[PDB]
Amino acid sequence: APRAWTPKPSPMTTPWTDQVPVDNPLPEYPRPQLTRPDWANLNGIWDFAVTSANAGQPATFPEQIRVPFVAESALSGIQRKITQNDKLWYKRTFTVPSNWNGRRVQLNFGASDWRTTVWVNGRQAGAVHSGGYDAFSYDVTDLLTAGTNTLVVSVWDPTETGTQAVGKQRIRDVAPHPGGGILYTAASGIWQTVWLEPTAAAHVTRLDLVPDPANSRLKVTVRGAGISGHQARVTVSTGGTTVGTATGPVGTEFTVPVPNPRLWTPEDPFLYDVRADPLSGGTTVDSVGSYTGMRTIALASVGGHQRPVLNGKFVFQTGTLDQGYWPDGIYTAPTDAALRHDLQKHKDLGFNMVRKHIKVEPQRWFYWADRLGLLVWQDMPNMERTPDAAARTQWEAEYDRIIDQHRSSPSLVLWVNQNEGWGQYDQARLADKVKAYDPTRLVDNMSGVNCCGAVDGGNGDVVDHHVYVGPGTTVPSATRAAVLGEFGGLGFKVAGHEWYPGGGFSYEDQPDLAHLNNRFVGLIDAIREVRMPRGLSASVYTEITDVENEVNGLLTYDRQVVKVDEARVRAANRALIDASR
Ligand SMILES: OC[C@@H](O)[C@@H]1NC[C@H](O)[C@H]1O
Ligand SMILES: [Mg+2]
Structure with missing residues (x-):
C-alpha cells in the first residue's frame, strides 16, 4: 500500500484552498463547448511515485497524489521540486459504467506537462504526447476489461532545461523565498481534468464555429473520427426556439442561418446553443452540444487610424x-x-x-x-x-x-x-x-x-x-x-x-x-x-x-x-x- 494521501499546508490560503474535494476535485464538465451527457471524471487520489527520468514503471508506488494538481503544489498533497532528472508516475484503478456497453471509450487529458506516456492494463494506449498546454486523448476501448482497470501515466518535464514551451515555469524550491524575479514555481505533471467518455465509433471530435453575423449566418465545420463520409445536421437555437438549421458535409465549411442575430459583446455576451449531429441518411450517429457567440474581430480604418473593430465598430x-x-x-x-x-x-x-x-x-x-x-x-x-x-x-x-x-x-x-x-x-x-x-x-x-x-x-x-x-x-x-x-x-x-x-x-x-x-x-x-x-x-x-x-x-x-x-x-x-x- 502507498503512504496515504496527506494534505500539505499551502504557502498562502485562497478562499478555496479548503474547498477542494479529496476524491473528486474539479468535478465540472471539462469541455463545455463540445458536450455529451455521459462521462466519468478520473480526478482524485492516485497512487504516485517519482523515479529517475529514464526509469520504467516502478514495482511499488510509495505515495499518493491529488490529480489534477502538479507535484510542486500544496493541493497535490506532494509539494516537491521536480527536476529534469526526475519522472512522475501516476496509477489508479477505474471501472467503466456498464451503460457504456457497445460504445468506444475515449480517455481524455486536458493537459499534462510535458511528455506523457499512458498504459491501460499494462498496454500502451497510443503515441507519447509532448506538450504541456494542449489537450490529447486515446481511444482505449480495446484495452479495457469489464472488471477493475488500471491506468498508469508517466510524465517527464525538464522545465527550462528543455527546448519546449515553458512560459514562466522554472525549477524552483517550492517553499516561498525571495529573489526569483518574474519567473515562478514550475508545474510538472497532470494539471487538468482526466476523464473518460463513451462515443459511437463514428463520432465528432471538433467543431469550428465561425460567426458571420454580417451575413446572418454561422459558418460551421464538423470534424471527427470516421465521419468524413457523412452529412451533419447543425442547429442553432436559444431556449426552446430553433433559430436555424442546415445539413451539410462533414469536414467542409457550410453555413447555418442565424437571422436577426443578437451579437456577442463584452456588455452583452449573448450565446446561442448549437447542436451537431453526424447523420447516415436520417439516422443520427452521434450528437454533441455546443454554443457560439455571434461576433467578428478585424482591422479597419476608423477616423483616420487602423483600429481593431468588434462587430464592425471600434471599441x-x-x-x-x-x-x-x-x-x-x-x-x-x-x-x-x-x-x-x-x-x-x-x-x-x-x-x-x-x-x-x-x-x-x-x-x-x-x-x-x-x-x-x-x-x-x-x-x-x-x-x-x-x-x-x-x-x-x-x-x-x-x-x-x-x-x-x-x-x-x-x-x-x-x-x-x-x-x-x-x-x-x-x-x-x-x-x-x-x-x-x-x-x-x-x-x-x-x-x-x-x-x-x-x-x-x-x-x-x-x-x-x-x-x-x-x-x-x-x-x-x-x-x-x-x-x-x-x-x-x-x-x-x-x-x-x-x-x-x-x-x-x-x-x-x-x-x-x-x-x-x-x-x-x-x-x-x-x-x-x-x-x-x-x-x-x-x-x-x-x-x-x-x-x-x-x-x-x-x-x-x-x-x-x-x-x-x-x-x-x-x-x-x-x-x-x-x-x-
Ligand atoms: O511578470 C509579468 C510582467 O511584469 C513581465 N513584464 C515583462 C514580461 O513580458 C512580463 O512577464
Ligand atoms: Mg512544467
Whole structure:
C-alpha cells in the first residue's frame, strides 16, 4: 500500500484552498463547448511515485497524489521540486459504467506537462504526447476489461532545461523565498481534468464555429473520427426556439442561418446553443452540444487610424495581464469558482479584455470568458532560448494544436505569437502562418517590439509596445493598430497577504493604497484623454494578481484582498470604453 494521501499546508490560503474535494476535485464538465451527457471524471487520489527520468514503471508506488494538481503544489498533497532528472508516475484503478456497453471509450487529458506516456492494463494506449498546454486523448476501448482497470501515466518535464514551451515555469524550491524575479514555481505533471467518455465509433471530435453575423449566418465545420463520409445536421437555437438549421458535409465549411442575430459583446455576451449531429441518411450517429457567440474581430480604418473593430465598430480593449498562477495550486485553480473569480474581477473592475500570459488555461477558462464577456488575447507560451530545428517543429506543432482547440471561442479574438523576444525566431513568417491558419482572429507577431531586443516581423495586425510605467506614445501604422501589450506594474505589499514577507518588487512601489489608486486611475485617464484619440486601441495592465514576489496585482496572490477601490477603477475603465465608442 502507498503512504496515504496527506494534505500539505499551502504557502498562502485562497478562499478555496479548503474547498477542494479529496476524491473528486474539479468535478465540472471539462469541455463545455463540445458536450455529451455521459462521462466519468478520473480526478482524485492516485497512487504516485517519482523515479529517475529514464526509469520504467516502478514495482511499488510509495505515495499518493491529488490529480489534477502538479507535484510542486500544496493541493497535490506532494509539494516537491521536480527536476529534469526526475519522472512522475501516476496509477489508479477505474471501472467503466456498464451503460457504456457497445460504445468506444475515449480517455481524455486536458493537459499534462510535458511528455506523457499512458498504459491501460499494462498496454500502451497510443503515441507519447509532448506538450504541456494542449489537450490529447486515446481511444482505449480495446484495452479495457469489464472488471477493475488500471491506468498508469508517466510524465517527464525538464522545465527550462528543455527546448519546449515553458512560459514562466522554472525549477524552483517550492517553499516561498525571495529573489526569483518574474519567473515562478514550475508545474510538472497532470494539471487538468482526466476523464473518460463513451462515443459511437463514428463520432465528432471538433467543431469550428465561425460567426458571420454580417451575413446572418454561422459558418460551421464538423470534424471527427470516421465521419468524413457523412452529412451533419447543425442547429442553432436559444431556449426552446430553433433559430436555424442546415445539413451539410462533414469536414467542409457550410453555413447555418442565424437571422436577426443578437451579437456577442463584452456588455452583452449573448450565446446561442448549437447542436451537431453526424447523420447516415436520417439516422443520427452521434450528437454533441455546443454554443457560439455571434461576433467578428478585424482591422479597419476608423477616423483616420487602423483600429481593431468588434462587430464592425471600434471599441477600446482595456485589459489586464493575467498569468494564471495560484499559490495553492500553482498552474491549477483550486475550484471552478476560483478559476472564474479572476475573470469576474476583471468585469467588476470594468475591464473588457484579458491577456492570458504565456500560459494556455483549460477549456473551462475559455468558457468563462465566453460567458462573462471578456475579449481574450492568448499568448503562445515561449521557449526559454532560441530553438533548434526539432524544437521549432515541436513548438509549432503545439501551437497548431492550441489554435485548433480554440476555433469556436467567442471571447478569443487575438493571438500573441511571441513575447519580448523570448526564444524568438521567424517573427514575420509565424505571423503570416498563424493568420492564415485562423484569419478570423487578430495576430500579434511580437509583444513589446519597442524593447528587450525583441525583433518586429513588421506584419500581423498590431504594433505592440510594453511601456512601464506608461502609457507611452505608441501610434498605429497604415497597416497595423497600436496596442500597449503591457504597462503599469504598480506595486504594493499587503501585510498578511505576501507570498514571501518583504520579498515584493514591482515597476513602481506605492507607499499606500491611496497612492496606488490615484496612480492607477491616472494611467487609464491618460489613455482615455490622450493616447486613445491619437490611435491607441488597447492596453494590458500588469497585472490582475500578485504572483509570488511580483506584487503588482490589483488583487493579492491569495485572492483575499482587492487592493483598489472597485467603483473608481470601474468608472475609469467604463469612461475609456464609452469614450472610444
Ligand atoms: O511578470 C509579468 C510582467 O511584469 C513581465 N513584464 C515583462 C514580461 O513580458 C512580463 O512577464
Ligand atoms: Mg512544467
